[PDB]
Amino acid sequence: KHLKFIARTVMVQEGNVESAYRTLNRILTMDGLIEDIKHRRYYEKPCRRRQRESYERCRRIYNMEMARKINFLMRKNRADPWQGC
Template sequence: PEPPVPPAPSRCRAEAAMANHLRFVGRTVMVQSGNVEAAYGALNRILSHDGLVDAVRRGRYYEKPCRRRQRLAYEACRRVYNAEMGRKIAFLARSSRQDPWPGC
């Protein structure tokens, strides 16, 4: 008789390690009451917010170094613009209240 083959513990350890990893837990979406469409939408929203969808789409084709620098410069300018615009909108929202400077 042959000795029994023990189960492969490496796969179980790998799954446990992956489940404990923060990025895995952060991108885990639970399916509630069999509603797969809602869970899929939530997962797509999470991945889009993380920028993973754009990175995969960009990685589909080679990006020349010049175009990469242009894209990164544009994204940096867009971040600065959005931050400044958010600051201005917050100021306008604050100044249009009854008491624009509460606590002063």
């Protein structure tokens, strides 16, 4: 019902079809549409979906915390200022 050639449309720049397709795929991946289709291929039971979502949230939280910890600790990754002690 909506107007066409607006949603999920990428203009090919100077005939570079491959780059345009890559940009479109990246846009869909960023918006999660590709994963949405992959998950919607078969029915995911609500308990399974809730478990997966909780696991993903916990994994993202843990990854962010670990990245913060690594960035904080890597400030000490420099030459030893007191070598020989």
